[PDB]
Amino acid sequence: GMVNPISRLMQIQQARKEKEPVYTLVEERGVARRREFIMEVSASGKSATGIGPTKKLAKKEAAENLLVMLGYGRS
Amino acid sequence: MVNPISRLMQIQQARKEKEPVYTLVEERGVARRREFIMEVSASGKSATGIGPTKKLAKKEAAENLLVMLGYGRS
């Protein structure tokens, strides 16, 4: 389908033999059609957040933002 | 069990908005494992979905659009 940033980050951490990423729910907020989730991910000494209308979409955004922070580029 | 195509159609009708528009994007894959890519637009947003038949891809596209529009899964 498309590159899953959760999987991409997991595979990078495995190749580095480093601790696997840790995901944390930060918040569920919003009324009616504006309901959204804020997720956080930490790996390799950095952390990032992401937002989406489901927990899994927010998790993917967090992983994508962390991959960018770690210097691995968008994907 | 709920058909997301029907759910999205009914929501658009109740909002008095334009009905959803579906577009076949691609058919790929391999042997029996077909991969159909469908796109749907409604209510100012669009989404894609993938499935082993056109109808399953259509349902996935509608489901992804319903989520994008804030109506939740299913």
Question: Which chain B residues are Cβ-neighbours of A35 within 8 angstroms?
Answer: 70, 72
Residue in B69, B70, B17 with CA at minimum distance from that of residue A32: B70
Q: Where are the beta strands (DSSP E) in B21-64?
A: 21-29, 34-42, 45-51
Q: Do A54 and B67 touch (CB under 8 A)?
A: yes
| Distance (Å, whole) CA A59 – CA A73 | 17
CB contact under 8 A, B70 and A34: yes
Cβ neighbors of B5 (< 8 A, separation 6 or more) are: B58, B59, B62
Which one-letter amino acid corresponds to residue B24?
L
Q: Are strands B21-29 and B34-42 parallel, antiparallel or unpaired?
A: antiparallel
Q: Which of A33, A34, A54 sits opposite B73 (nearest CB)?
A: A54
Structure tokens at A24: 């944390």
Method in brief: X-ray
Q: Do A57 and B67 touch (CB under 8 A)?
A: yes
Resolution for this experimental structure (Å): 1.4
Closest to A36 in 3D by CA, of A46, A45, A44, A26: A26
Residue-by-residue DSSP string for chain A: ----HHHHHHHHHHHTTPPPPEEEEEEEE-SGGG-EEEEEEEETTEEEEEEESSHHHHHHHHHHHHHHHTT----
